[model samples]
Target chain A: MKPKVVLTHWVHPEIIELLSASADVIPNTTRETLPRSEVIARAKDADALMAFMPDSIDSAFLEECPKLRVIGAALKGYDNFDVNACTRHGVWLTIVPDLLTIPTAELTIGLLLGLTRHMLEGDRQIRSGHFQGWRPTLYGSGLTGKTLGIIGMGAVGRAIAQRLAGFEMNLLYCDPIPLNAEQEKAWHVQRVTLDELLEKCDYVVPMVPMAAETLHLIDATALAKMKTGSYLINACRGSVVDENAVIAALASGKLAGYAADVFEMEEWIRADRPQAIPKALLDNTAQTFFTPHLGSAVKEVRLEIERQAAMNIIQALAGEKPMGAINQP
Target chain B: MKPKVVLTHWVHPEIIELLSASADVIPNTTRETLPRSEVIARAKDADALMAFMPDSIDSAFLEECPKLRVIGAALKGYDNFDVNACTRHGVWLTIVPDLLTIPTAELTIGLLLGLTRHMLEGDRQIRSGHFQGWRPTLYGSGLTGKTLGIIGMGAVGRAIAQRLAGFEMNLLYCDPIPLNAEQEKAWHVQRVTLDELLEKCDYVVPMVPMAAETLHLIDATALAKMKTGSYLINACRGSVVDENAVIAALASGKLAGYAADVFEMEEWIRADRPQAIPKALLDNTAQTFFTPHLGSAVKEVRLEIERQAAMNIIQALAGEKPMGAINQP
Candidate 1:
């Protein structure tokens, strides 16, 4: 009999097809999102688990699935998986990492444009009975001949630069290490210190990870350094910006606009954690735009992720070293 | 004796300097936003009245300024002026319409990018500390390779098209008549029928005049034909959009977003009428964005409009017909 593999949720067809070519696959086609209880129960019959973040991977789960040799978190950010537990159980664990770079970067660009132009606010207005007509005066601003600052030059950052190349924007970036000649030419970028980047750019975006070195990067001082009438976009981690400082800056008219996708407190607040979302952020009266984290939520990106996750699972089943492996015992 | 001219508010220094050279300029240095009483009282003492909007233009005020041969409405859109009363009094009504086309067009492009990407939303999320890190599931759509449809291919529309050239968007336009070869090549635009334009473009912007035929042009029928995920921007006239239909479309997500600077009920709903001041559009959850008619509110545009208004006053005073004369009885 083929080695058994269980997918926690219904994923892309390509992934299922690829996995089935090598192993016995159990696919769950359910009416609602598969509950954790169902996931735990299903794990008992499988040797490998293809999972999403919503599923819990605890000592108890490993205790039940004695034959489980590999666990693949089918998404980036594997915080949902218990790496230590998987290692103790002599199971390999992997996650999809920078695989989402292009899609996430593309979204960052879109989010930046949306916030700068008051798209959400306008959407609300058009839905109201107020779309009267255009006047000589209207909500208009231009982006050409403006500066764009990228706080981190990771994979997603590079992708953003590639897309913005057509815009002919003046590019300023801040990274710990300098980029190579090929990258510089491709991005047409000017590497600057963080302070200079903040001071000069018309629009600023952070694409850095949520590491200790980057938390609250855009505090009151950094915001104050930004040029008057400048806009900021954050598509990286939510903890990078100081929300209170931003509200204060907007209130004082020091900054022109703010757009962001990552929120420091989104997950906890969404899950009803105490002190999840702050009142100052909610009360801010400035031109602010937001969406629930949606940098890589396109159909194409999701499909790609599912395929890669399935590949990782299949590799471990084949007794080969899996890609993106974080722990192996 | 120097020809007497009453200046209602502070204008650009270039115009102030130019006018002071050739006329006796009675400047309202009181810097306080002159109330209606002060404006009418000041108008009673001048030969030519150079004014910005927000000063009353009713028949009652026109009767008070008998010596006002030239009434210079500083910016474009002279709907506030009682043109018939001005015509009956033989007042050569002058407005600055053409100068605003470029700036307003630039702003429209900015608004387009803003809406499509949800830039403001990103900014809000970052500043509020709600930003979590990016995931492949973070959703936002891209604008590259999308269609941009212009309702009126006037000066403003042409400028908007020019700016969009670098963004790699396909430009589709609907006009009363087709554009010439030179115009088409300048922006690589295609002239399509209204229905074709609606069917193709990802962004549909109404840049037409507020005339009988054009009023409410983007009613339910027109909006129904557009792509489900597309956006509409009205930088033309508030009445050009059917607000009821637009609201319904937005509520049902038939149309992704809509933005407008002009509103039909603005006169009663907004506190900052006739001026580009901050005002809440409505109290609802529709995807709309509204600004206080700020198309030509940039420093450069305002200066030019003031200068044009002043020059029109000077030209009319010299017995030369002003460039933007709407009526002369």
Candidate 2:
């Protein structure tokens, strides 16, 4: 008999084609996300489960699925899945990671330019037919010879450093650990403290992951430490920067601009969640740019995600361990 | 009698202050432009004429100003100075050209990005709360590794090429005369014919001065030769490219985008012109980005123009020939 696998939401079509070739695939056919109650009820008899970011696989849901042997998350971040709950239930959990560094880094550069040059502001002016003429002080700034401080000296951080090489930007970095001699020499990254990196750099980009110690890392104090004329770009998790602190800093003109691909409660917030939205975004005057967490939305990156997730699920079904198994089974 | 001077209109305060110190300067006291009759009447008694582009200095006007020994244009482009008329009248005309090269070059780059990336469109969406989300194909093609073709190889063109060096773009050039070996090596520019340059490059920028041979140089035939995905950028003269040809090409999608700082008959065809005012702009679903001739609107550049114009007038009054004299007298 083929092992049963319940996949939540339709991912890249290629993932469905690949998984169906080896196992009995139960893909969610609906375009809209399934209700949590429906997901809890349907996941009962499944041998394995493939999940998206919004779906919760807690102790209550896990207890119903007695035959579930493993769970594969279709994303890099797995904060939605209760790791301890899965571990206590003797169910293995896995994720695909480290494939999206370069693309995300490139997007971060675009976001930074978008903020400083008033690229978005100019667009509004053109469409409204208020683009009367250029003035001496119009949407103007020089990005060359400016300092760019990267918070996490990880894969994404190094990739960003490589991209900025051609632009001749000053690269400063702060991380828990220092980079190796080769990395420092090759990328020309100067390791500095968080406070120094914030105060000295003209552009500050945070690329660290969200962990227990990392949440709210850039609070009011950190925001205040940033240069008054500087820009803040966050392509990493939103919880790392306190939302209220960012709003206050922007409103007070302590920070010139803020760009984010994700918000603190983005997963639950829909297009209509006005109350959950940030006040900075609501105020048109505030230099805020936001995208719906599209850091890994490019075609090439999507294909990679699908391939990695399929391999992880296939290995687990064959009584073998996957490369990114998060729990000790 | 005081050494007399006639100014076409109000110029930079510095130029007025300098001229007031030495000569009996007749500044255009009114904010509005002086009528042709008024200007001709005033110039009859003046020894020198200080000019602006808005003021018409035709053969008729030169005939009226018999006492005008020197004509100084407060701008880089001397098209408005009527060189033929000045030479016929033995009125040495001087211009301030090279001082604006770097500043105008910088502005050209900003306009290039604004057009290509739909910066104005993006900003409008954010401001109006219409920025729904981000997709891979949101804006224009990314600039990395793209070829940039410069249509003129003068000082302004060279300055633009130098600044684009940091963008890591491939450089091509189209000039009446090809660059020398040292110039080719130093700027890394490959000279090509206008057609070849248009066909090969992604972004074609024209920086040529307006001249009889260059007028309507980029006509319907020339625009037809360009690649379908290519963008046309003109920081040059409005008459350099046939406006009708550009409008047709842009409408038919033969060209991806058209960004013009100057446009033919812009002043003639105003709100009550025969053609609908909105139709002049709002091309190709807002792909055409137009500015009101602000290529040299930077502070440093404007001040230099005023300083140079004042120096030309002072030098001529002192019986010393101006450095930027167009026709030797």
Candidate 3:
């Protein structure tokens, strides 16, 4: 019998063909994440499994699907994924982590401008039939001479800096490995300490990765240290920020506004657990803006990611190593 | 009554002070645009007037308030002020035309980014409690490598080009007056004809001042010439575009989306006449995003504009030439 590859999510037809050439492709053409039972059943006899965040590839999944040889994740950040469990089960958990830097930076710029310009609130007023004329209530700060602090200088952070360098704002950044002076001058950015960035900026955006050392990166103390009436844009992991502290800061007017595209407990929800954005945070509609994790939501970007995952599946089925593999097995 | 200056809309205390020193300041401390009858009654004995669009300075008002020596418009547009009639009535229509380039440019960028990123739609979903997890839909285009056309190289257009120079976009602009080669190179912009811009751009933003020749600038022909599935951003005067043509392009899928900070017949709304955004345009929330003329809604910007208007009033009252006078009366 031909080795079978079970698809856990709908992907490009080209990807289906790529998987079809290697093995029988069990497609989830329903275009929705399958139920846990259905996913497990489909993977029982599969040689390879193509998955997404909602698919819980944990120890239970590994034990149930002992025949699985490889699982390709078409996204970055193995949050819901069980990397160690896959290694123990001799199953490759491959990830496609490239091609998201520009999109996330683009979304972060939109999110920051949306909050400071009251784009959402302004649209809601007109949509709700409340916009009579230019009123005095929706006054927002212009970004002409304001200061913007980027907390990390990773790929996405540098991308963000590159996009915003044209704006007349003073750009400041803090990172463990600061850029060389030539690189900094090219991007028109100034290197500063985290404390200085927090104290001096009108807006601070954190682009650090999700790790133990980065958890609650913008916790209560960090929020207090921020300049009063400053803004925060968090496009990275949700746990990096303390939502409760953000709520308190908004209430006390210590933080002028908060805009995020990710939320805390994101992994929990991915693991089939129930959670919602905090009530207080959602209720403060005037000062807060949130998106439903749209950093890599571009259709073209997702299709390219699927293509990469398909190639990874083919590589593993060919008895070779896959790129971006989280587990050697 | 030391030369009364009537304030039809609310303004800063400093503006009131400047006006008070020149004349008895008839303040609208209620912080709302006054009724037409109230404005007429207040201006009966006034020597100068500080007016916004909502206060219609038509021929009737000019004839009724013959004591008015000058009108200090706190806005840049002359949609409601009858300049020829004011000249005939021996009144100077003074306009404060400075200090709006950066704010409007900022809003335009925000509005454009808001459309391309599905920011409003994404936020609405999460706020409406429907955010289960990242789904396959709500995909939008990334601005990287996209062609953006700026239809006018006016102050706001030039400012926008300056701000977006860092973005990795092919910037093309068309105007009656093209930028010099040095200026073009500095902003990393290319001067193209209107037809070329329409044919090549993924997004087109119009920044021409509203005038007789500019009325209906983006009419049916102009909209049809634009590339299919492209977007339009309108941040200037609303009358410059034919809204019906825009609606058709959006319906026919020729235009992927339309975001505007201004709307057609804005003068009617300013005159306290009933008008709303077109029902079809409002209903097409998936392909359209709009703001309530928020181009200059920044508090700091408004304060400075008020200061300039106040200075104009003082200058006109002192028998000196006003900076932006439309009439020599």
Candidate 4:
């Protein structure tokens, strides 16, 4: 009998075809996320499981799915999965990284430009019949000659820097482990402390991942350090920033604008619960720009991620060493 | 007696101070545009006239202001100013060229990004309390690896190209006079016919100046050639596009989006007569973006333009060769 594989969510057709060619593939066709109980029940007899970010594959889940030997996460970050549980169970855990770097970085730059040029406000004015011809004070600011501070120097950060190199902006970054001298020189970036970056840069971008140390990194204190009239762009995880503090900064005029794709209360947002969103954010919509967490939503990038995740599962189930394995069996 | 100079509208304080030191300056301080008759009445005895685009200084107006020896236009495009009328009256015409190139180009790219990333729609969703977390289909398109077609390779177009060089876009341009091989190589651009550009490019931008031959250049037939789901960005004059044709194209989904700062009926827009704007455009605002002709609206650029216009007036009144003279005495 062929090894059975269970997919928790729908993915690209190509990936499903590849999985079905070698293994008995069970794909959840429901557009909504499957209930944890349903996932565990359906995946119990499977040899492998392919999951999305919202799936909770913990110790209890591993115990229930005793036949699962490998888990392929169709995401760059695997905060939802229990890595220690997978390690203890001797099940391989793999992720698809590097697929979203370019798309996410491009979205970050797009958000920055949208904020600086008042594109959203301008569009609203036109839509509401408020546009009254060309005025000298219509725009907020320009990008050239401004300082851009990046909080992390990982793949997404590097790609963002590379795309903005021709705009003639002064680039500054704060990372625990700095890039080598040659890499820094090539990208035209300078290393600085977090405080220095916040105080000097006109646009402060937090691109760090979510962790115990990173949570609320841009809290009230960090926001207080930012230059007056500067903008804060958060393309990273919502947990990394304090949404309430950002709203306060915007209220006090400490921040000229806030453009973010991630939200601290993402569970509420994901569930379409508007009341759970900060009232202040909803009130000052003009000053706050939101993107529904679309950093890597490009169709091509998502397909690539799906393909890589499926390939990892295929290779591991075939008794070969799968690429991008976070935990070894 | 000092050479009396009449400024048709308010300018930067620095420019007013400079004009005051050299010439007895009469600046119209009212925020609203002054009546043409009143402007003519005020400048009847002025040695020079510094005017905005709305100030219609024709041969008859020049006859009314007999002492107006030179007309210093505080703009790059002199379409509003009757050059033949100025020449017939032997009035020197000067413009503040090269002042708005960078700012205009920067805004063009900003609008393009805004349209592609669905920044406006996202803002509207958040403002209306309809944003439901990150969905895979939130944005419309991505910019990287896309083709950008430019109509008219003027200074503004070239500046836009330079700023977008790092975005890794495929650049194609259509110009009456094509660039030489060296220039094309330097800019990494390819010369293509207008039809080819419209059919192939993801983003089509018209940056040509307004002229007899260029009016309504992107009419119904031209917009029909554009690829389905493509975008049109116009930072040029309103006369270059047919408003009705664009409206129909947008309604039919022939074009995914249209972002423009100029209007075909700019007089009504400048006059704040929203009733005169195309009702179709106002009805379909979701598919269109407007900026109120704010191409060169940056504070720094406006100040520079004011200073340059003042310098031209000062030099011309002093009987020296003024910079950027459109028509010689």
Query: Number of the top candidate by TM-score?
Result: 3
For model 3, the superposed segments whose C-alpha errors exceed 4 Å read A130-132, A209-213, A267-274, B30-32, B88-90, B130-132, B267-274
Candidates, ranked, DockQ: 3, 4, 1, 2
DockQ of each: 0.16, 0.16, 0.64, 0.44
Superposition error at A106 for model 3 (Å): 1.2
Candidate 4 per-residue lDDT, tens place, B90-194, comes to 788999878778778888887887777676666666666655454444446777889999999988888877667777789999998988888787668899998
Name the candidate that leads on lDDT.
Answer: 3
User: Which parts of model 2 have CA positions greater than 4 angstroms off?
Assistant: A1-15, A23-50, A64-70, A90-92, A128-139, A168-171, A174-199, A209-228, A240-256, A265-275, A285-288, A318-320, B1-76, B84-329
Which predicted model would earn the best DockQ?
A: 3
Write model 1 residue lDDT over B117-225, tens digit each, in one string: 5544544554565443343222334555678899988777877776566455688998987789997886679999999999998789988865779767999999889
| TM-scores, each model vs. reference | 0.69, 0.67, 0.93, 0.83
Candidate with better lDDT, 1 vs 4: 4
Give the 10-residue window scoring lowest on summed lDDT in candidate 3 chain A: A265-274
Cα lDDT for residue A178, model 1?
80
What does fnat come to for each candidate? 0.22, 0.07, 0.62, 0.49
Candidate 1 lDDT over A74-134, as tens digits, reads 8776766778999999899988865667656766665665555455555554545444433
